[PDB]
Design a protein around this ligand. Structure first.
Ligand SMILES: *[C@@H]1O[C@H](CO)[C@@H](O[C@H]2O[C@H](CO)[C@@H](O)[C@H](O[C@H]3O[C@H](CO)[C@@H](O)[C@H](O[C@H]4O[C@H](CO)[C@@H](O)[C@H](O)[C@@H]4O)[C@@H]3O)[C@@H]2O)[C@H](O)[C@H]1NC(C)=O
Ligand code: 9EL
Ligand code: 9EL
Ligand code: NAG
Ligand code: NAG
Lengths: 727, 727
């Protein structure tokens, strides 16, 4: 048999298969296969061809992505894709009728549009061009302007600014249609007083002078952007006079200082939910607002207002959890950590402030996925008491003791990590199994809860991997200060406990992480074990997620303390197990893991020989406000400046004398500025420590352009092989 | 026994001694002992003690450098020196009185002062502050304001912008007293439409948002700064009425296009000479310009225009040569390249304009050092047909054929490399022998040409060095195309000719460079030969200078051609001598030889195992217009675009596949911008070539900071050691 090699991973020799589908009705879904968008049927297979390989064959453009209007007439066609940050990007748009086999020509959508969306019923459009919002009742009719305020790097109507895209909404889009599209809600951010990160972009070598990029980006302690919120009524627009947009202003609990808007969620045709959140992120307020068909303004009755606050840390996991209303929009289920530290479902009622918990236990609820008039469906890590694994549950709404696993025992040895995807009224759901066996995608009915057929079993792949010498995964735990803490090892094949193999520690360890899980992946780590016989290990100690607040909030206000000491104390444990060479212990990480790699090599620990750190944070005052202050407070004397300063990589430069270090960064990293590593290399130079570094011209935080991607992973390969002595 | 070590070199153990002085009369001069300013009579001994190793403990501030008034009465004092480009700085300035031992308070010279200088006779003063000229007649009294155009980054009055500073005057100063102190001329530089290089400066940990530095800088082709000249007189100044400057405008041979000011030289109290050079630098014009007691303006008579031009290449070694004038102002001597392309001395008489040559042969006048009614004194490389060497001669104005060498046989073994400084009217002079033996400082008398005393012979060092296994040096040549080309080698202690050594090839190789000399050096090569046993060898090939124009102009319009060829050629010669190990041959170099080293590695000859390039130029359109265009012409397709594009390091990427490369660059390089290396790296990553790289945070083109000077020489030494396989 052959061994998994570095090239298999770089030329992507052994591809996993998956089954991407869209639902479009309670009965039906879509699936391109050979570029043929088919329409599949859920009960039988009465299935039909919706769109040809070709058709658009003669577009003389690459169709970047597609979208159908939910009434079925039209299709949106996206191309000329030009990326911005993580989720943001600018594109060109053309619409196509399917009852007329024809494409629109008039009032078409202006090139370089920031975002496009359909209403949920019918075929109206909302789009954002040049920071402003536009609406199109019908695709061919002129477009209704809605804002004027929009200005590049100042005002943003209906799109997120830099920081709200990254660490709040995870989206560029900041619009929300009502259920039938009557209204359109939106958001407005203001960066006027927010300062600019500046950096260089070199480009094609043809370019003579290098460009500076200026991005409004508020670092810890700095002036942040502000947020306003409105709802406009789409069903009465005027050819003649402007559009009146009703502001639903925040509550006074929030208006007294820097706050954030963190959630927008419709309940009914005329009832919307808001969540807000103070800059000090331990205090959140929800608000339920009804339409007044007398004054078309919007009421949010203080009785219906809902508080959520934290005594042990910060509200939500990354943000306040999201509420799921019952069809009358008169109660709602929602994730809220109970009073033992564990995250479970609460059933609220629009007008009463106690909630009633419908789940109990030492395990957490990952997500509410769906809601009928007799069942709620949710995802937990309950099965066999493992926080690394995910499974699907339904709960009988007339009797909270009547509760049922639907995935656990379909096939428990191959399958332990499930997502679920629902038909438009939970008549059906697809299930996705990510591991530990080979992904298994399958289809089910909610009535019988009986599975109709297999969609994809990853068999092509199965057959090749009988040809490959492959690694093995212990997942298990160990006990400390009285507590279980999960790790995973990737073990080379024919792995023999006699022998003392070398050990790379793959780290992340930032708040609410999990690196110890039931998932199946072929990755770098697989190559190192398969081909270099290196044990790859990960470890979720304090800070880590899905195991309660007692374990998530340990690091609150004290980042770069317990997550570092825990990575170190787990390496100790691994040495003492004695199939590990206690002189060949290395460590690596990226982003937050690169920081923690950097703090651990700075620690004077004795334990590690080699380190590699990729776009690491080195000093929290350099990261942005919204992520940083959530866990750190504000960097003033009056609050938490002191930990801010003890917690910097720079203060540890002299101890790298004891280790071999490698430091890599993109020159054009918007997220964690090159600044951050600049400051590290400088401190190590000024106390005379030798070390290695690669810059990567013009890459960002992902370093994911194909060629940079082959370089880095090779370069790091050479460094590990080199320090471990592998020939 | 012990050897010369990286640490001796970095920590600067074995120090030379120089004997600097300041002639301040025809027969007296200053100089420190420790902390203490003596004046020394020349005839015999009088020491006088001009100032004390105390006196200035009084002062508070951290004094820096001193200047004295011609009439000997005042002394100017520098502090808060705050470093800028390569000659440009800012400082503060207090004036002490020497007759009193008082200190001027009422009306001083403000902080952040840019340049300041005494007139040549008496106690008159001119300075520049926010780009404006100011004169003081008396140091106790109210400054006179000369210009009001000055403006940061656009208008430079009495001082150079970045291009004139680096590439023409090698000076921040652009003022010119008349010899008796009356008139004062200055240059005004414009920079309105010169575009702007932009780069990051991180400063201390404590700075939260980096700083973007913005500097006006023309690259190849770009828009240059234009230039204007003026004379103003200093006896007729008015305190009611603003102060008049007379323009003197360039000749119309120059005015039709882009052109530069390349030299300013006063001949009489009322006659000035101005040299102009075209943008395309194969054509210069000299003007000679008398006063006019009646009009008040300056008259540049056109019988007195001397046109120097070129056809093999460019005018000058790097610019037009300077004139030395006959006391009366009516004739001058100037070095010019003759009909066979050797530089020698020409007598000109202002009205007739064919110069007569005073010297000839197959060797070259380095420079003209002094003029008496009787003799001309010059430095040259004639002695023994050796361009490496340097020696002082004198020639009789009454009879050319009669020329004495003042330095040749003085001390023939130890001393072949001379420089000189004469007293106010050439009665005495100091000699400076800088190699091949230890440096040796002496005093001489004109009338006798008498060897008065030895001022310093460095025997302190001489003892020390008899404890160490010092390397040895060979200087010598080879013959290519029936022409001599000089190499020097640094050879290890107890060099054994039957052995194989690895070989590093130090490189510069720029136009009119010279690496093969008889100078004496303690440097990184010293360390590499004595301690790690490497032969370190440089080579003076095509382009190199002081050997005339057939060799020098060979690269005309054609950089990165022959000089690269010849660097490979030289390494090939050396390996066939049979004490070289064909498998271990490196190359490296900073600045120009960074480029030359890159292009060698990128050439795919295979002769070089590995290489290191420090701050290289990778592509000529990234470099400044003045130096670049001087050797390439213009990057238009109606001039030299095709070579500009063929001569890039980046188009040689796929060959770096046969080599271990190490690329290094200061992030704040204001000259060769980090731009240049960024494009190299990107190129290599694209074709997939492993290399190693290092940035230096906020260092510039020198990487001179104490700690970084150390970091890089240590990093580089490791890299070579890897490559030659040495511990
Ligand atoms: C340094 O160099 C600068 C240019 O590089 C120079 O500034 C002159 O040039 C700028 C271009 O940057 C010009 O804008 C300006 O001159 C012109 O200004 C107007 C254009 O915006 C134009 O209307 C003017 O013409 C008018 O007035 C003149 C008389 O004043 C008449 O000839 C015209 O008919 C018309 O009525 C004018 O041509 C700048 O003067 C800086 O001055 C220079 N600084 C130095 C030398 O100190
Ligand atoms: C907006 O929501 C999220 C943001 C998340 C983020 C996560 C990791 C998980 C997240 C998960 C959610 C969620 N859900 O990590 C990101 C992150 C954290 C770092 F320390 C860092 F150096 C770079 C970086 F991108 C951070 N900027 C945003
Ligand atoms: C204006 O005067 C000079 C400038 C000189 C210069 C010399 C080398 C010798 C010089 C000699 C003189 C003289 N004389 O080289 C310098 C130089 C050349 C390069 F290719 C480069 F990348 C950087 C660099 F500083 C260039 N900036 C100016
Ligand atoms: C955005 O905020 C800025 C503060 O600089 C203010 O001047 C401007 O009026 C605001 N724009 C709005 C809210 O329309
Ligand atoms: C000198 O000229 C400047 C600017 O051109 C002007 O402001 C000033 O009045 C003049 N100075 C005096 C003292 O008249």
């Amino acid at each position: 048999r052959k061994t998994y090699t570095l090239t298999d991973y770089l030329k992507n020799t052994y591809r996993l298969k998956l089954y991407s589908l869209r639902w479009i009705s309670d009965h039906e879904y879509l699936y391109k296969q050979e570029n043929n968008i088919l329409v599949f049927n859920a009960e039988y297979g009465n299935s039909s061809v919706f769109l040809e390989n070709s058709t658009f064959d003669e577009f003389g453009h690459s169709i970047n992505d597609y979208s159908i209007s939910p009434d079925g007439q039209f299709i949106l066609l996206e191309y000329n894709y030009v990326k911005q940050w993580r989720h943001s990007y600018t594109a060109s748009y053309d619409i196509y009728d399917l009852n007329k086999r024809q494409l629109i020509t008039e009032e078409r959508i202006p090139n370089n549009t920031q975002w496009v969306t359909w209403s949920p019923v019918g075929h109206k459009l909302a789009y954002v061009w040049n920071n402003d919002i536009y609406v199109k009742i019908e695709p061919n009719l002129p477009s209704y302007r809605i804002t004027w305020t929009g200005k590049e790097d100042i005002i943003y109507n209906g799109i997120t600014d830099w920081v709200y895209e990254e660490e709040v909404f995870s989206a560029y889009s900041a619009l929300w249609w009502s259920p039938n599209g009557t209204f359109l809600a939106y958001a407005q951010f203001n960066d006027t007083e927010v300062p600019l990160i500046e950096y260089s972009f070199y480009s094609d070598e043809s370019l003579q002078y290098p460009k500076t990029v200026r991005v409004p980006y508020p670092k810890a302690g700095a002036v942040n952007p502000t947020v306003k919120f409105f709802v406009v009524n789409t069903d009465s627009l005027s050819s003649v006079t402007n559009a009146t947009s009703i502001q639903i202003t925040a509550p006074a609990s929030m208006l007294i200082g820097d706050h954030y808007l963190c959630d927008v969620t419709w309940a009914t045709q005329e009832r919307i939910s808001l969540q807000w959140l103070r800059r000090i992120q331990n205090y959140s307020v929800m608000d339920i607002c009804d339409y007044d068909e007398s004054s078309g303004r919007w009421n949010c009755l203080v009785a219906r207002q809902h508080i959520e606050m934290s005594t042990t840390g910060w509200v939500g996991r990354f943000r306040p959890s999201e509420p799921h209303f019952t069809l009358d929009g008169n109660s709602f289920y929602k994730i809220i950590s109970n009073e033992e530290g564990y995250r479970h479902i609460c059933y609220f009622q629009i007008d009463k402030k106690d909630c009633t918990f419908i789940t109990k236990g030492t395990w957490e609820v990952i997500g509410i996925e769906a809601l009928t008039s007799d069942y709620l469906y949710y995802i937990s890590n309950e099965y066999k008491g493992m926080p690394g694994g995910r499974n699907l549950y339904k709960i009988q709404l007339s009797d909270y003791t009547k509760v049922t696993c639907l995935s656990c025992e379909l096939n428990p040895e191959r399958c332990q990590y499930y997502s679920v995807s629902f038909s438009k009224e939970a008549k059906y759901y697809q299930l996705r199994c990510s591991g530990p066996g080979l992904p298994l995608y399958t289809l089910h009915s909610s009535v019988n809860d009986k599975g109709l057929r297999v969609l994809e079993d990853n068999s092509a792949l199965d057959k090749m991997l009988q040809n490959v010498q492959m690694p093995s995964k212990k997942l298990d735990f160990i006990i400390l200060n009285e507590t279980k803490f999960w790790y995973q090892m990737i073990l080379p094949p024919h792995f023999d406990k006699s022998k003392k193999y070398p050990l790379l520690l793959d780290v992340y360890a930032g708040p609410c992480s999990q690196k110890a899980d039931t998932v199946f992946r072929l990755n770098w780590a697989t190559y190192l074990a398969s081909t270099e016989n290196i044990i790859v290990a990960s470890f979720d100690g304090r800070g880590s997620g899905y195991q309660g607040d007692k374990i998530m909030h340990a690091i609150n206000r004290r980042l770069g303390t317990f997550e570092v000491e825990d990575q170190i104390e787990a390496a100790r444990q691994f040495s003492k197990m004695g199939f590990v060479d206690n002189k060949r212990i290395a460590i690596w990480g990226w982003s937050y893991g690169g920081y923690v790699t950097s703090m651990v090599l700075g620690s004077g620990s004795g334990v590690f020989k080699c380190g590699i750190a990729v776009a690491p944070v080195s000093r929290w005052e350099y990261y942005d406000s919204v992520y940083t202050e959530r866990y750190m407070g504000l960097p003033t004397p009056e609050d938490n400046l002191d930990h801010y300063r003890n917690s910097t990589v720079m203060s540890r430069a002299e101890n790298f004398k004891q280790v071999e270090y490698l430091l890599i960064h993109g020159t054009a990293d918007d997220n964690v500025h090159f600044q951050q590593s600049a400051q590290i290399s400088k401190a190590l130079v000024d106390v005379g420590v030798d070390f290695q570094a690669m810059w990567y011209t013009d890459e960002d935080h992902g370093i994911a352009s194909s060629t940079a991607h082959q370089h880095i992973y090779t370069h790091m390969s050479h460094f590990i092989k080199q320090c471990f002595s592998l020939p």
